[PDB]
């Protein structure tokens, strides 16, 4: 049953990673749009 705490801990840390990835994705897609609007500029 100690195993249950390690699964729980993995679930929580993974959620923080998922949230961090979502944040990066939006920042990156924004950078790409700005860059594509500097290429054409």
């Amino acid at each position: 049953m100690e195993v249950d705490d390690r699964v729980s801990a993995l679930e929580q840390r993974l959620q923080l990673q998922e949230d961090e990835l979502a944040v990066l994705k939006a920042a990156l897609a924004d950078a790409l749009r700005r860059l594509r609007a500097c290429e054409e500029q």
Copy 2:
């Protein structure tokens, strides 16, 4: 069931892996485009 939770974890980890691969290739493209614009900027100066 613990096996169901570990399975659900493995699925979420695979999807994270896909996303990271894609974001990494996308970042590489972004840096290329950035370097190009910087080189254009310095040349224009």
Copy 3:
């Protein structure tokens, strides 16, 4: 047996953490340099 899967997941999660860290750091620099290019084109 399920502990071997859990251990393997912990080792994978940390490698993914490290990947994201490289991505985040390089993106931070790119944005800094992006702003600079925008600002030296708004003044121009």
